[PDB]
mmCIF file of all heavy atoms in Angstrom:
data_model
loop_
_atom_site.group_PDB
_atom_site.id
_atom_site.type_symbol
_atom_site.label_atom_id
_atom_site.label_comp_id
_atom_site.label_asym_id
_atom_site.label_seq_id
_atom_site.Cartn_x
_atom_site.Cartn_y
_atom_site.Cartn_z
ATOM 1 N N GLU A 1 111.909 100.414 106.488
ATOM 2 C CA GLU A 1 111.774 99.169 107.234
ATOM 3 C C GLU A 1 110.773 99.350 108.371
ATOM 4 O O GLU A 1 110.650 100.435 108.938
ATOM 5 C CB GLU A 1 113.129 98.714 107.780
ATOM 6 N N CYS A 2 110.046 98.284 108.690
ATOM 7 C CA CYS A 2 109.020 98.353 109.721
ATOM 8 C C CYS A 2 109.650 98.638 111.084
ATOM 9 O O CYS A 2 110.739 98.148 111.384
ATOM 10 C CB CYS A 2 108.210 97.053 109.760
ATOM 11 S SG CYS A 2 107.283 96.675 108.233
ATOM 12 N N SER A 3 108.996 99.471 111.885
ATOM 13 C CA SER A 3 109.396 99.650 113.277
ATOM 14 C C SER A 3 108.601 98.762 114.238
ATOM 15 O O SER A 3 108.956 98.615 115.407
ATOM 16 C CB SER A 3 109.250 101.115 113.673
ATOM 17 O OG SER A 3 107.986 101.605 113.270
ATOM 18 N N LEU A 4 107.518 98.178 113.744
ATOM 19 C CA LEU A 4 106.733 97.232 114.525
ATOM 20 C C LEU A 4 107.179 95.795 114.244
ATOM 21 O O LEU A 4 107.776 95.526 113.204
ATOM 22 C CB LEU A 4 105.246 97.420 114.232
ATOM 23 C CG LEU A 4 104.790 98.868 114.431
ATOM 24 C CD1 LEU A 4 103.309 99.026 114.108
ATOM 25 C CD2 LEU A 4 105.095 99.310 115.853
ATOM 26 N N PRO A 5 106.904 94.871 115.178
ATOM 27 C CA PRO A 5 107.171 93.443 114.949
ATOM 28 C C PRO A 5 106.537 92.927 113.655
ATOM 29 O O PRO A 5 105.357 93.174 113.398
ATOM 30 C CB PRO A 5 106.512 92.777 116.159
ATOM 31 C CG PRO A 5 106.651 93.811 117.247
ATOM 32 C CD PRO A 5 106.443 95.135 116.553
ATOM 33 N N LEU A 6 107.318 92.208 112.856
ATOM 34 C CA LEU A 6 106.863 91.734 111.550
ATOM 35 C C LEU A 6 105.857 90.595 111.631
ATOM 36 O O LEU A 6 105.944 89.715 112.493
ATOM 37 C CB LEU A 6 108.053 91.272 110.702
ATOM 38 C CG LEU A 6 109.056 92.354 110.306
ATOM 39 C CD1 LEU A 6 110.137 91.774 109.401
ATOM 40 C CD2 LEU A 6 108.316 93.506 109.623
ATOM 41 N N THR A 7 104.886 90.628 110.735
ATOM 42 C CA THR A 7 104.047 89.468 110.493
ATOM 43 C C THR A 7 104.765 88.527 109.531
ATOM 44 O O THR A 7 104.693 87.314 109.664
ATOM 45 C CB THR A 7 102.691 89.883 109.940
ATOM 46 O OG1 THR A 7 102.112 90.830 110.841
ATOM 47 C CG2 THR A 7 101.767 88.674 109.811
ATOM 48 N N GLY A 8 105.470 89.109 108.565
ATOM 49 C CA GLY A 8 106.305 88.345 107.659
ATOM 50 C C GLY A 8 107.363 89.203 106.991
ATOM 51 O O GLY A 8 107.206 90.424 106.872
ATOM 52 N N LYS A 9 108.444 88.561 106.552
ATOM 53 C CA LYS A 9 109.518 89.252 105.848
ATOM 54 C C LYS A 9 109.408 88.956 104.352
ATOM 55 O O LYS A 9 109.297 87.798 103.953
ATOM 56 C CB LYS A 9 110.879 88.792 106.383
ATOM 57 C CG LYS A 9 112.057 89.645 105.931
ATOM 58 C CD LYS A 9 113.390 88.952 106.209
ATOM 59 C CE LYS A 9 114.209 89.666 107.283
ATOM 60 N NZ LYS A 9 113.688 89.419 108.657
ATOM 61 N N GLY A 10 109.427 89.998 103.527
ATOM 62 C CA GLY A 10 109.330 89.832 102.086
ATOM 63 C C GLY A 10 108.152 88.978 101.635
ATOM 64 O O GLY A 10 108.268 88.197 100.690
ATOM 65 N N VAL A 11 107.031 89.087 102.343
ATOM 66 C CA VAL A 11 105.823 88.341 101.989
ATOM 67 C C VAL A 11 104.747 89.077 101.166
ATOM 68 O O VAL A 11 103.823 88.447 100.665
ATOM 69 C CB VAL A 11 105.174 87.741 103.240
ATOM 70 C CG1 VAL A 11 106.140 86.767 103.913
ATOM 71 C CG2 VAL A 11 104.781 88.850 104.204
ATOM 72 N N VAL A 12 104.861 90.388 101.008
ATOM 73 C CA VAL A 12 103.812 91.140 100.315
ATOM 74 C C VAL A 12 104.080 91.271 98.815
ATOM 75 O O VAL A 12 105.130 91.772 98.422
ATOM 76 C CB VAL A 12 103.629 92.545 100.919
ATOM 77 C CG1 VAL A 12 102.548 93.310 100.168
ATOM 78 C CG2 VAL A 12 103.283 92.443 102.394
ATOM 79 N N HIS A 13 103.149 90.790 97.989
ATOM 80 C CA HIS A 13 103.257 90.929 96.532
ATOM 81 C C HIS A 13 102.757 92.275 96.061
ATOM 82 O O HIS A 13 103.367 92.914 95.207
ATOM 83 C CB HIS A 13 102.480 89.829 95.806
ATOM 84 C CG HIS A 13 102.838 88.444 96.244
ATOM 85 N ND1 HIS A 13 102.059 87.716 97.115
ATOM 86 C CD2 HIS A 13 103.894 87.656 95.935
ATOM 87 C CE1 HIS A 13 102.617 86.537 97.324
ATOM 88 N NE2 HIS A 13 103.734 86.475 96.623
ATOM 89 N N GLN A 14 101.636 92.703 96.628
ATOM 90 C CA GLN A 14 101.007 93.945 96.218
ATOM 91 C C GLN A 14 100.458 94.711 97.422
ATOM 92 O O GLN A 14 99.940 94.121 98.367
ATOM 93 C CB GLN A 14 99.897 93.654 95.205
ATOM 94 C CG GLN A 14 99.268 94.878 94.562
ATOM 95 C CD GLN A 14 98.134 94.503 93.622
ATOM 96 O OE1 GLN A 14 97.441 93.507 93.836
ATOM 97 N NE2 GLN A 14 97.947 95.291 92.567
ATOM 98 N N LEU A 15 100.593 96.032 97.376
ATOM 99 C CA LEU A 15 100.076 96.910 98.415
ATOM 100 C C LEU A 15 99.217 97.975 97.769
ATOM 101 O O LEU A 15 99.629 98.610 96.796
ATOM 102 C CB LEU A 15 101.217 97.580 99.191
ATOM 103 C CG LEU A 15 100.826 98.803 100.037
ATOM 104 C CD1 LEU A 15 100.076 98.373 101.283
ATOM 105 C CD2 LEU A 15 102.048 99.629 100.412
ATOM 106 N N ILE A 16 98.024 98.168 98.318
ATOM 107 C CA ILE A 16 97.095 99.177 97.821
ATOM 108 C C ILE A 16 96.747 100.148 98.943
ATOM 109 O O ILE A 16 96.227 99.745 99.985
ATOM 110 C CB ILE A 16 95.788 98.534 97.312
ATOM 111 C CG1 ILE A 16 96.078 97.544 96.180
ATOM 112 C CG2 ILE A 16 94.807 99.604 96.862
ATOM 113 C CD1 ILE A 16 94.907 96.657 95.831
ATOM 114 N N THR A 17 97.043 101.425 98.734
ATOM 115 C CA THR A 17 96.651 102.444 99.689
ATOM 116 C C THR A 17 95.717 103.429 99.010
ATOM 117 O O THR A 17 95.445 103.312 97.816
ATOM 118 C CB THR A 17 97.871 103.213 100.227
ATOM 119 O OG1 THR A 17 98.409 104.050 99.193
ATOM 120 C CG2 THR A 17 98.938 102.250 100.721
ATOM 121 N N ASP A 18 95.232 104.402 99.776
ATOM 122 C CA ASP A 18 94.385 105.471 99.253
ATOM 123 C C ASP A 18 95.144 106.386 98.297
ATOM 124 O O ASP A 18 94.547 107.168 97.564
ATOM 125 C CB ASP A 18 93.784 106.295 100.402
ATOM 126 C CG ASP A 18 94.817 106.679 101.464
ATOM 127 O OD1 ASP A 18 95.830 105.964 101.610
ATOM 128 O OD2 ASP A 18 94.608 107.690 102.166
ATOM 129 N N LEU A 19 96.467 106.285 98.312
ATOM 130 C CA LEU A 19 97.303 107.103 97.442
ATOM 131 C C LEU A 19 97.712 106.356 96.176
ATOM 132 O O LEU A 19 97.465 106.830 95.067
ATOM 133 C CB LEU A 19 98.523 107.653 98.178
ATOM 134 C CG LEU A 19 98.229 108.588 99.355
ATOM 135 C CD1 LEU A 19 99.520 109.148 99.917
ATOM 136 C CD2 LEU A 19 97.302 109.711 98.939
ATOM 137 N N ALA A 20 98.385 105.221 96.342
ATOM 138 C CA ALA A 20 98.950 104.507 95.202
ATOM 139 C C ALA A 20 98.767 102.993 95.237
ATOM 140 O O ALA A 20 98.135 102.439 96.139
ATOM 141 C CB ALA A 20 100.423 104.840 95.067
ATOM 142 N N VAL A 21 99.320 102.340 94.221
ATOM 143 C CA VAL A 21 99.423 100.888 94.188
ATOM 144 C C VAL A 21 100.883 100.491 93.968
ATOM 145 O O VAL A 21 101.520 100.945 93.013
ATOM 146 C CB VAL A 21 98.553 100.279 93.079
ATOM 147 C CG1 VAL A 21 98.809 98.793 92.981
ATOM 148 C CG2 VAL A 21 97.078 100.541 93.352
ATOM 149 N N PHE A 22 101.412 99.659 94.863
ATOM 150 C CA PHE A 22 102.798 99.206 94.774
ATOM 151 C C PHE A 22 102.882 97.699 94.539
ATOM 152 O O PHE A 22 102.027 96.941 95.003
ATOM 153 C CB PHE A 22 103.557 99.530 96.061
ATOM 154 C CG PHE A 22 103.544 100.985 96.439
ATOM 155 C CD1 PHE A 22 102.607 101.472 97.334
ATOM 156 C CD2 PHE A 22 104.492 101.857 95.930
ATOM 157 C CE1 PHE A 22 102.600 102.805 97.700
ATOM 158 C CE2 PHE A 22 104.491 103.188 96.290
ATOM 159 C CZ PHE A 22 103.539 103.663 97.175
ATOM 160 N N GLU A 23 103.925 97.273 93.834
ATOM 161 C CA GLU A 23 104.198 95.854 93.642
ATOM 162 C C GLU A 23 105.614 95.545 94.115
ATOM 163 O O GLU A 23 106.473 96.428 94.129
ATOM 164 C CB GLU A 23 104.023 95.457 92.174
ATOM 165 C CG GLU A 23 102.614 95.661 91.642
ATOM 166 C CD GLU A 23 102.438 95.149 90.220
ATOM 167 O OE1 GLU A 23 103.443 94.715 89.614
ATOM 168 O OE2 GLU A 23 101.295 95.180 89.708
ATOM 169 N N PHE A 24 105.853 94.298 94.508
ATOM 170 C CA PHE A 24 107.149 93.914 95.060
ATOM 171 C C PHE A 24 107.828 92.790 94.279
ATOM 172 O O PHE A 24 107.268 91.705 94.108
ATOM 173 C CB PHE A 24 107.011 93.523 96.536
ATOM 174 C CG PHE A 24 106.458 94.620 97.403
ATOM 175 C CD1 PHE A 24 105.092 94.852 97.462
ATOM 176 C CD2 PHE A 24 107.302 95.419 98.156
ATOM 177 C CE1 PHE A 24 104.581 95.861 98.256
ATOM 178 C CE2 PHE A 24 106.796 96.432 98.951
ATOM 179 C CZ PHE A 24 105.434 96.648 99.005
ATOM 180 N N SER A 25 109.037 93.063 93.805
ATOM 181 C CA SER A 25 109.845 92.050 93.142
ATOM 182 C C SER A 25 111.306 92.173 93.563
ATOM 183 O O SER A 25 111.901 93.248 93.469
ATOM 184 C CB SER A 25 109.713 92.170 91.626
ATOM 185 O OG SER A 25 110.040 93.479 91.197
ATOM 186 N N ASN A 26 111.871 91.060 94.028
ATOM 187 C CA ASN A 26 113.262 91.000 94.483
ATOM 188 C C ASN A 26 113.703 92.175 95.358
ATOM 189 O O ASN A 26 114.577 92.954 94.974
ATOM 190 C CB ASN A 26 114.222 90.818 93.298
ATOM 191 C CG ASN A 26 114.094 91.917 92.259
ATOM 192 O OD1 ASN A 26 113.269 91.831 91.347
ATOM 193 N ND2 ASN A 26 114.915 92.955 92.387
ATOM 194 N N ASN A 27 113.090 92.292 96.534
ATOM 195 C CA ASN A 27 113.495 93.287 97.527
ATOM 196 C C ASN A 27 113.228 94.732 97.099
ATOM 197 O O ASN A 27 113.459 95.670 97.867
ATOM 198 C CB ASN A 27 114.968 93.104 97.898
ATOM 199 C CG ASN A 27 115.316 91.659 98.193
ATOM 200 O OD1 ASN A 27 116.243 91.099 97.605
ATOM 201 N ND2 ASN A 27 114.567 91.043 99.102
ATOM 202 N N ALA A 28 112.755 94.904 95.867
ATOM 203 C CA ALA A 28 112.472 96.228 95.324
ATOM 204 C C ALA A 28 110.979 96.541 95.361
ATOM 205 O O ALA A 28 110.145 95.671 95.108
ATOM 206 C CB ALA A 28 112.996 96.336 93.897
ATOM 207 N N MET A 29 110.645 97.786 95.683
ATOM 208 C CA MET A 29 109.263 98.234 95.627
ATOM 209 C C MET A 29 109.077 99.083 94.379
ATOM 210 O O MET A 29 109.973 99.834 93.989
ATOM 211 C CB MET A 29 108.892 99.034 96.879
ATOM 212 C CG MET A 29 107.391 99.200 97.088
ATOM 213 S SD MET A 29 106.965 100.286 98.650
ATOM 214 C CE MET A 29 105.110 99.782 98.933
ATOM 215 N N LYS A 30 107.920 98.962 93.742
ATOM 216 C CA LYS A 30 107.664 99.709 92.521
ATOM 217 C C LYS A 30 106.268 100.314 92.544
ATOM 218 O O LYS A 30 105.281 99.615 92.799
ATOM 219 C CB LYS A 30 107.814 98.796 91.303
ATOM 220 C CG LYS A 30 108.985 97.827 91.395
ATOM 221 C CD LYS A 30 108.957 96.817 90.256
ATOM 222 C CE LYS A 30 107.619 96.092 90.187
ATOM 223 N NZ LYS A 30 107.559 95.110 89.064
ATOM 224 N N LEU A 31 106.179 101.612 92.279
ATOM 225 C CA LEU A 31 104.881 102.259 92.182
ATOM 226 C C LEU A 31 104.304 101.985 90.795
ATOM 227 O O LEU A 31 104.866 102.413 89.792
ATOM 228 C CB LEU A 31 105.061 103.763 92.400
ATOM 229 C CG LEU A 31 103.940 104.704 91.974
ATOM 230 C CD1 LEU A 31 102.657 104.333 92.680
ATOM 231 C CD2 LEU A 31 104.333 106.137 92.281
ATOM 232 N N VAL A 32 103.207 101.235 90.731
ATOM 233 C CA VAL A 32 102.592 100.941 89.437
ATOM 234 C C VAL A 32 101.344 101.752 89.055
ATOM 235 O O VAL A 32 100.967 101.802 87.883
ATOM 236 C CB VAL A 32 102.324 99.433 89.298
ATOM 237 C CG1 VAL A 32 103.561 98.668 89.727
ATOM 238 C CG2 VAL A 32 101.133 99.015 90.140
ATOM 239 N N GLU A 33 100.724 102.409 90.028
ATOM 240 C CA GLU A 33 99.496 103.160 89.772
ATOM 241 C C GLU A 33 99.309 104.279 90.772
ATOM 242 O O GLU A 33 99.703 104.160 91.931
ATOM 243 C CB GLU A 33 98.264 102.262 89.852
ATOM 244 C CG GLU A 33 98.278 101.059 88.952
ATOM 245 C CD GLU A 33 96.956 100.315 88.990
ATOM 246 O OE1 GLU A 33 95.978 100.884 89.532
ATOM 247 O OE2 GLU A 33 96.897 99.169 88.484
ATOM 248 N N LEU A 34 98.681 105.356 90.324
ATOM 249 C CA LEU A 34 98.240 106.398 91.231
ATOM 250 C C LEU A 34 96.735 106.265 91.382
ATOM 251 O O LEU A 34 96.028 105.988 90.412
ATOM 252 C CB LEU A 34 98.597 107.778 90.678
ATOM 253 C CG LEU A 34 100.064 108.006 90.295
ATOM 254 C CD1 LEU A 34 100.216 109.273 89.466
ATOM 255 C CD2 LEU A 34 100.960 108.054 91.529
ATOM 256 N N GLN A 35 96.244 106.430 92.602
ATOM 257 C CA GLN A 35 94.808 106.512 92.815
ATOM 258 C C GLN A 35 94.306 107.798 92.161
ATOM 259 O O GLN A 35 95.059 108.771 92.032
ATOM 260 C CB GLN A 35 94.476 106.507 94.310
ATOM 261 C CG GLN A 35 94.732 105.178 95.012
ATOM 262 C CD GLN A 35 93.714 104.110 94.654
ATOM 263 O OE1 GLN A 35 93.073 104.168 93.605
ATOM 264 N NE2 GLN A 35 93.556 103.130 95.535
ATOM 265 N N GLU A 36 93.041 107.800 91.750
ATOM 266 C CA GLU A 36 92.458 108.956 91.074
ATOM 267 C C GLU A 36 92.603 110.223 91.908
ATOM 268 O O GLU A 36 92.226 110.257 93.079
ATOM 269 C CB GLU A 36 90.983 108.706 90.759
#
């Protein structure tokens, strides 16, 4: 859970970092891809 003030709650569909790609469905996070 965020320690900083939220911009939104449960608003992110997809997250892309330098490490992986995550998707969000029903409060659950799922790793769908690894970066090369």
Side-chain angles (χ1 to χ4, degrees), residues 2-35:
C2 297
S3 48
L4 306 179
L6 295 183
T7 305
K9 192 194 248 76
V11 299
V12 179
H13 307 101
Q14 187 183 31
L15 164 74
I16 301 167
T17 71
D18 47 334
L19 298 185
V21 174
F22 303 95
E23 298 185 355
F24 301 81
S25 55
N26 57 273
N27 313 126
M29 196 182 198
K30 320 172 306 179
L31 163 58
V32 313
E33 304 186 12
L34 306 167
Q35 290 287 23

